[PDB]
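Dear support,

We are seeing what looks like truncated structure output for some complexes. This example has five components. We would appreciate it if you could run it in full and send us the complete token output so we can diff it against ours.
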Amino acid sequence: CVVNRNGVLETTINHFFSRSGLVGVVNLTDGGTDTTGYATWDIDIMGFVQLRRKCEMFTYMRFNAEFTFVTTTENGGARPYMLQYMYVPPGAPKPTGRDAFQWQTATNPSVFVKLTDPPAQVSVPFMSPASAYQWFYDGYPTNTTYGLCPNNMMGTFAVRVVSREASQLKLQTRVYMKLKHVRAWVPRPIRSQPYLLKNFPNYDSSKITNSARDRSSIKQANM
Amino acid sequence: TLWYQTNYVVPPETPGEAYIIAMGAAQDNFTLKICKDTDE
Amino acid sequence: NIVLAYGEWPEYCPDTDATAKPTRPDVSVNRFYTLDSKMWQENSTGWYWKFPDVLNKTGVFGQNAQFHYLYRSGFCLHVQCNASKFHQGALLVAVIPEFVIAGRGSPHPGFTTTFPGTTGATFYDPYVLDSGVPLSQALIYPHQWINLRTNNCATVIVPYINAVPFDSAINHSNFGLIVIPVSPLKYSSGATTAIPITITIAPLNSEFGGLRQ
Amino acid sequence: NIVLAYGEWPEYCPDTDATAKPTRPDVSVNRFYTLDSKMWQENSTGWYWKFPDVLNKTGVFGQNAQFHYLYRSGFCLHVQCNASKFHQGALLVAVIPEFVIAGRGSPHPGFTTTFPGTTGATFYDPYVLDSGVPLSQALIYPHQWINLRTNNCATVIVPYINAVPFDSAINHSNFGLIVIPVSPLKYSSGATTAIPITITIAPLNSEFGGLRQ
Amino acid sequence: TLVGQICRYYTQWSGSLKVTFMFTGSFMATGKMLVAYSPPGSAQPANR
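Here is the complete output from our reference environment:
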């Protein structure tokens, strides 16, 4: 039915990673003494198996990232409370409490945006000591030490409500990551086996799932 | 020396033993000095 | 004839910092290193060799890559099997950069499983390349078929592929050389059961920086 | 391709005395004389043919060399064996000038042992060439190997080598053609046991002087 | 050999040599060999 050719602008390596999707959800639950009042989130893209399967088609990747924080309350009614979205660069210590001294360090760039405002958007550059992110490392950093590369660290965010005397909110931050200026160098086949762990390629060899669904005989094309 | 790198591969109905014969001579810069009778 | 990995003809490092300096060794290290011949049978299941792990503790390259903490080199790989006109089968000879052995059973692999040495280890599940990644799509890598009714040799020339222009030759292994029989070996009764597979490695443009002891 | 004995391309006699005179026969005598085919087996041990004894009493050359008391000629020798690709072995085809059969047992050899005729005799001890002289050094002579996995034919072109430019073709035999299997013949069960070895002789520049009867 | 019998005369000798191998198997057979020469200071190798 289709006679013409489609567009080649939509198959490129920058449009395949273009749109921003959900990458992580954290919860604060401020209020009282037994509750913490803060919530950190290590930046990683291998959290959800839909972005993990797309980025493990390649070995070396180089990109920027811009973030957007959609915070609501537990029900939805947002009264104006001032928040703080900090950023701990790799090599700096994470906060230990809602009133610790890591919140006032001037080298951690924080963002002060209320609940009633549009969501706080900010951009993070290429933060690796190498010249490309590696998602497959065949070596040791010197059992559980094989295949770990510390050149993929990007940072945390540590959401916190700015107040004095323990407001009783229960918030929920949703983080949306957009990949910009994407460059991918060497390709590799897409994974067929289901995932077992988050940082390792383990695949549960006791049941090898097949890459093609079965049919009756080899001589019938109807499947 | 003379080492086996890969084992001796034959098709069916072909004998499995063979032989190598070794040869040897001197090059152009080979010279000789003071004469002497041989020891048979 | 030859397969050229990503169309590069590997070269030396251009104008990098922290080197004025690294030694460029002569043909004392760039000779032909012939490893052992692996016997391919009916129930055989594949092999893999890690680079430059197969040339550590071996000759001049072993005495240089163990006493230097920078390393950059490209290789020339020559896999050849000697079969008659009465045997049949096919081999897939590919070069996988950053080839990570997974680990099986729902459990991380040992040291000799991922760094096998000169005697390269054998696959347990060649259908998923022991990494959950199918052999059906493993022709992305620079590959060459060894079909026993057409050819016997396969030559792949691999450059240096890494995000850092100098690493250590002991901790990090850049790529792996798989040889997997896709079609099994069959022969009539009376022929030679095992067919050898010999591999010759010649380093092209090796560099070493910073000497120890 | 061809082995040329001592690099000569044999010619006629230059300006000798007592010939003004000798007849130079045409291609009626310079045709291709094909002798019998000798069957080479597992326990075979070699053969030798004396020249020009093998072409006495045979054709036009027999009627000329028996009725002339001077003789000078050079030959072209073509030894060829017909084997399949399942047989194996090697032959040493050499040309020995003034090849003297010794005699064994601490006892002179007979007439048919040293002058065998067209059916050339077989060796008793090929390791010492039946003359106390080892086969290990018998590659001084103009030789060519017939290895059954490489070639089948061997061509040697021999000039006239003698201290006198004219002798009798009946009493004196100038050289001998040995064919000795250095490596024995082996074959799997079912193949042809005996492999023939055929020899073709073409005289080049024959001369005869002085006619009888 | 010929080079080794004319030097049971001639007390001293010095020069280069060569050693030629040839194989006498069937045309169908296939294999490999390694031909290694050690210098005169060292013994023969114990491994390939």
